[PDB]
Amino acid sequence: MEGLAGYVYKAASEGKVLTLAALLLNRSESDIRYLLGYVSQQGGQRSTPLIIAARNGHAKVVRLLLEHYRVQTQQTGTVRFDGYVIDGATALWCAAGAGHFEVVKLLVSHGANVNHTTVTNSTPLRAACFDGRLDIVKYLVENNANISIANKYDNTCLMIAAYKGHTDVVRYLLEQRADPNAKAHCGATALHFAAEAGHIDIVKELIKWRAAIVVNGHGMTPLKVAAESCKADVVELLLSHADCDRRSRIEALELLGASFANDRENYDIIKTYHYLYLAMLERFQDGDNILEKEVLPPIHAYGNRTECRNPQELESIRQDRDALHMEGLIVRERILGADNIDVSHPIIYRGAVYADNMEFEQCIKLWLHALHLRQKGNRNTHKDLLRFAQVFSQMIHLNETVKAPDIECVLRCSVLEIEQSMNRVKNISDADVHNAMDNYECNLYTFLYLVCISTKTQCSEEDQCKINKQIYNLIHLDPRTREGFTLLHLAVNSNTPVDDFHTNDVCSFPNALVTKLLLDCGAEVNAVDNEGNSALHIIVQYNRPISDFLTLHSIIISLVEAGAHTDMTNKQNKTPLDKSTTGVSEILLKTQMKMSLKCLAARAVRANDINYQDQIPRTLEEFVGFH
């Protein structure tokens, strides 16, 4: 009976308009709610045959399902639309999202919820407007469906339609008395989105319908947002707003030059110099009432430049491209502020360019500044820490010296970010717990990469003391991954993931130096994972005893000297000698096994399975617990 409905679900994507008749003629009746109400998942999309027909663009299958009968179509589900998954979708929502006007009109005429908000409180109108067409939204707004309905993040139809280059859609929206000054949860008011994608006609139509300029939540005017994303025509239009004053105009021009300095999609240096020079000239337009630049004190990351308060000094840095890169970074920092979200991206890109040109020291300085700015904003910076690990590994691989204070700074940042990662993991229950655990695991991996790099970098007594202080601080929180792996277990484990980039040239696990440093920094040597293995079980399960026998011997000596039992069992009640899976490792461990009557007695008790609960001392109770 299940296969009969599964074949109909499979044929819903196909065409069997006059073929599926044999399955239903002289069929039963009590299975209607399971055949028509078949809610299956073809790959993980909670849907019906009608829903997948609308999503794929089969109005003929909808008419098939409404040939001589009728099916209820308004159902919740998580449909994986082209690009991404959406939870709480429905038939009308999916028909609108795929740009099928006829299917949408068929669903409306047959009866569908025009306001069927998803789990993310998303209306079908904005779902259509993501790929909006005029003809598909005509009847949708003529079905008395309110366009002023908010969203999970208050992204209304107008905001997304202005962001996605849908001038016809925004025209039909504002011509029907929509909300001009709508406020999103992030604070943007449908002009920042219109100026984010550089749509000149959309901004033209919004200013035509009296959109007006108001600062968003992040302390940026729409003009400054337009100048942030390297767009020019919308900046010219917004400067032609006729109510813009002058201070905002010069700071917008400087920001436009700054954005043109560092962005891959729009990179010009002549445009940067010309925009900054226009800012300088229009700044000193009168002589008296000269708009002297207030300049923040020089920051060591961008060299030691101090902007340019004069036309002569802007002329002096005309031909020097890297000087103009630093100048653009500095004016962007001054205008956008250090608390902006999209101020660290050009710093990261400039550090990347300097890394590609084999100038690592300035790359390290710029990336440290970007990491500090991103950490003060309390954002997901695991990608940045992985980038730090990659650039340090490339510095080591070219036999280039790595400055110890840089490693200390990035280690402090990684420790702090792992602290907030633990806080986020504890706070998040099930919304994005998988994403939080992935970020936590990759952050632990980045910290171990940084530790492995720090082992191979020459440091003084003070520098090594500070690095060991950071390592000691991170040990005393006892970070753990999904399968209970402590920070020692990951450095011990050969199965610890290594980034496919240049970290492969430096950080290879198991690494003896990392384990020696961690044990010398006070790691819990007897710690266990969810599987119950200690560090010793993981290191004896190493499948390569001859290729890096020196590494294996050093790490086994370190773990034994640190005081781990050579006898403790895992959850599967296996002594690591029984889990050595290697003659060489077994011989080494049996050489390092210190004989003791205590372990022999405890193992005898465990083997005979004598009832020891509430008979022996509690510490010895635990002792026989793991022996």
Binding site: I86, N151, I160, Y163, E196, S229, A352, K383, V391
Partner: peptide
Amino acid sequence: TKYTFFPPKKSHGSCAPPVSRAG
């Protein structure tokens, strides 16, 4: 193509718009 040191983020830019149909 994240392998090059060029930033994995496109331009970020998802600060003010939470991208619809993306999660």
